[PDB]
Amino acid sequence: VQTITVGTGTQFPNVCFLDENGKLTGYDVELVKEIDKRLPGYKFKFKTMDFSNLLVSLGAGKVDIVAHQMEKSKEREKKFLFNDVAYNNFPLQLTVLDSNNSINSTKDLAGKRVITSATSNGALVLKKINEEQGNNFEIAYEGQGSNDTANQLKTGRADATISTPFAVDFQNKTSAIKEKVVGDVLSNAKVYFMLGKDETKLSKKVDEALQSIIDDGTLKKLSEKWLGADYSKEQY
Numbered sequence: 001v002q003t004i005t006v007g008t009g010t011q012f013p014n015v016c017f018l019d020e021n022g023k024l025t026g027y028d029v030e031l032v033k034e035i036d037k038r039l040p041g042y043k044f045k046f047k048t049m050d051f052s053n054l055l056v057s058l059g060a061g062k063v064d065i066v067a068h069q070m071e072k073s074k075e076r077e078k079k080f081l082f083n084d085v086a087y088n089n090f091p092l093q094l095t096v097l098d099s100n101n102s103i104n105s106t107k108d109l110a111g112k113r114v115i116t117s118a119t120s121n122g123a124l125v126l127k128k129i130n131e132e133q134g135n136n137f138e139i140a141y142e143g144q145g146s147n148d149t150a151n152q153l154k155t156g157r158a159d160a161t162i163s164t165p166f167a168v169d170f171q172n173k174t175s176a177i178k179e180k181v182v183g184d185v186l187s188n189a190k191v192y193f194m195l196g197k198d199e200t201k202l203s204k205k206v207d208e209a210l211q212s213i214i215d216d217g218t219l220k221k222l223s224e225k226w227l228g229a230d231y232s233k234e235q236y
């Protein structure tokens with residue numbers, strides 16, 4: 001039996017987070033556990049870290065796989081292996097306070113400040129748009145607590161962020177700060193596991209397991225539980 005170390009986070013509610021009993025859980029975590037169950041030649045264990053360190057760790061060989069709703073991009077494919085079978089969609093839109101109707105196009109960001117998560121695909125998508133627009137807006141990276149994305153939108157310190165409907169909808173359920181998506185879909189990447197380029201055997205095994213999880217209806221059930229019925233599909 002080969003031990004596989006999976007890098008993930010703890011700061012994505014319903015995706016990778018610690019519950020009331022200090023147990024790591026959420027969609028990505030539970031999917032990996034389901035995959036492990038179906039691969040008797042492997043044992044999967046987790047290594048939790050800041051999201052921003054996950055691909056630094058993967059690149060240094062300190063984890064074998066990353067599971068954190070990772071969007072496929074050509075930049076990431078130049079460095080890492082993606083498995084073939086997707087396990088979510090992560091369509092990105094500008095996201096604003098529910099009261100704010102001043103922004104639809106990215107052109108409406110001129111002179112404004114956008115807050116995002118360092119190292120995320122959405123940050124890259126925004127960077128490229130900024131450059132296309134002649135550097136006409138500011139991109140900043142969230143911090144913790146009162147400096148997180150939601151709080152900087154609440155106070156007006158940030159005018160917008162970039163996010164996906166399933167995530168926005170879940171956050172809104174319990175928050176005083178209501179966010180909404182606006183405008184066009186800026187990126188429509190699917191979500192996969194990320195591995196080292198040498199890890200072709202493991203990637204194939206993961207795809208076999210994930211396909212069986214799709215085929216028996218388990219992914220439908222897992223996605224309904226964690227993502228909500230509106231975001232739950234038989235396959236992605």
Ligand SMILES: N[C@@H](Cc1c[nH]c[nH+]1)C(=O)O
Nearest residue numbers: 068069070071090120121
């Ligand atoms: N989907 C993001 C990961 C993420 C961070 N926070 C929420 N999602 C990416 O591919 O970079």
Ligand SMILES: [Cl-]
Nearest residue numbers: 039040041042
């Ligand atoms: Cl196996």
Ligand code: NA
Nearest residue numbers: 036039040042
């Ligand atoms: Na296993």
